[PDB]
Antibody, heavy 221, light 210 residues
């Protein structure tokens, strides 16, 4: 089946270059064109360009000079190179398939990829500090106790939070991240039967891909 | 130029008909512009609905239709459902490029309301060593996705030091959010009661600690 998956660098510095890949599956690039679209934070969609089956490309004139699209038929990959970044190039970048073989001729973007988030910033990568969130109020609320981990001061996003190496899938909530002075902070919570904790250990596992850092915090009363 | 505009927000209720329009800065919308209507669903789920002005994609509900209303392209939803609540983007082809409109935010009333679950967490001893203290107020399973959280230190409402996240959609279509009160370790030790008060559609849910 028709699938499109983007992969990109995550963090890039102003005035440098951006390269993203669209890996397609379920259709051949020798027969279908692919479009590149971006969505700046709290903005609508903006078309960047298309590469047709035959190799011709067309670009949004506003970008025309800084953008370049190319492909690898055998590899099922489309690439977007974007230069002269400014922080306003921060966006979700999407690839979508081009289609026109309809009953009456018309061009349509029929299947969309899931997107890849690119942060354009001169801010430094900084590993997180992990703190346990324990009830404090150790009074039995009911049968369940809810615990958490505070992931503080990291850049850039994302961070991955797991409980007891994925075992606890049980009402796990990973909240959206807040950004204060270029450092993100997020929390994750887990709900467990109160008869269990602290008898049975609860550990949160945090991974910060950009700093290749892994931290585990055991949550104790 | 070749600026496509759409209404920015529209609201309907289930069973009503709503028409969304798409205008070209350049002139009347024609068949040759192949108006495409794309739907954006929470957490960047894009789905193509109509292509070439009036061709509904095969998986799309029969209640979606597209047409040329005068000089503009139109998307009509006949008997709108709660799940039609999304952002709708219009795109027009101009022989060598596509131009997307700003998108229309469609709100469908009659959605099922849900009150927030609030949890208040004290600063950890580990964090206090660093001379900072963060109180964490988690809010889950609420609908619609807009709350108001107020914090009080020793009965007195706090003015500064709090940060609230923008609500996010959970797998279950309800929302989540988090509020943070950052104090210095000193301040933490100078006060006694801490309260997180969350206001959702007229009601208030507060949680406290000592």
């Amino acid at each position: 089946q028709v699938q499109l998956k983007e992969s990109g660098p995550g963090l890039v510095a102003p005035s440098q270059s951006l390269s993203i890949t669209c890996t397609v599956s379920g259709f051949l690039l020798i027969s279908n064109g692919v479009h590149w679209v971006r969505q700046p934070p709290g903005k609508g969609l903006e078309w960047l360009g298309v590469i047709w089956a035959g190799g011709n490309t067309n670009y949004n004139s506003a970008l025309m000079s800084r953008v370049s699209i190319s492909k690898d038929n055998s590899k099922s990959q489309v690439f977007l190179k974007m230069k002269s970044l400014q922080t306003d190039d921060t966006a979700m970048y999407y690839c979508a398939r081009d289609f026109y073989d309809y009953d009456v001729f018309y061009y349509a973007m029929d299947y969309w990829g899931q997107g890849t988030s690119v942060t354009v910033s001169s801010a430094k990568t900084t590993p997180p500090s992990v703190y346990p969130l324990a009830p404090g109020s150790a009074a039995q609320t009911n049968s369940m106790v809810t615990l958490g981990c505070l992931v503080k001061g990291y850049f850039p996003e994302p961070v991955t939070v797991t409980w007891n190496s994925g075992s606890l899938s049980s009402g796990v909530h990973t909240f959206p991240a807040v950004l204060q002075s270029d450092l993100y902070t997020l929390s994750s919570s887990v709900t467990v039967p109160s008869s269990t904790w602290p008898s049975e250990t609860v550990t949160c596992n945090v991974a910060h891909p950009a700093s290749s850092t892994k931290v585990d915090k055991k949550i104790v009363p | 130029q070749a600026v496509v505009t759409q209404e920015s927000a529209l609201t309907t209720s289930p069973g009503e008909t709503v028409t969304l329009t798409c205008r070209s800065s350049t002139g009347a919308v024609t068949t040759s512009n192949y108006a495409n209507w794309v739907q954006e669903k929470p957490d960047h789920l894009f789905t193509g609905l109509i292509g070439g002005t009036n061709n509904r994609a095969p998986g799309v509900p029969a209640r979606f239709s597209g047409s040329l209303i005068g000089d503009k392209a139109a998307l009509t939803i006949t008997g709108a459902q709660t799940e039609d609540e999304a952002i709708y983007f219009c795109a027009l082809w101009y022989s060598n490029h596509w131009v997307f409109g700003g998108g229309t935010k469609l709100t469908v009333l009659g959605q099922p309301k849900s009150s927030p679950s609030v949890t208040l967490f004290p600063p950890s001893s580990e964090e206090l060593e660093t001379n900072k203290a963060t109180l964490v107020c988690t809010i889950t399973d609420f609908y619609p996705g807009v709350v108001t959280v107020d914090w009080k230190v020793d009965g007195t409402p706090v003015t500064q030091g709090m940060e609230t996240t923008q609500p996010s959609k959970q797998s279950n279509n309800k929302y989540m959010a988090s509020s943070y009160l950052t104090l210095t370790a000193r301040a933490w030790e100078r006060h006694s009661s801490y309260s997180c008060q969350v206001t959702h559609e007229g009601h208030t849910v507060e949680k406290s600690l000592s």
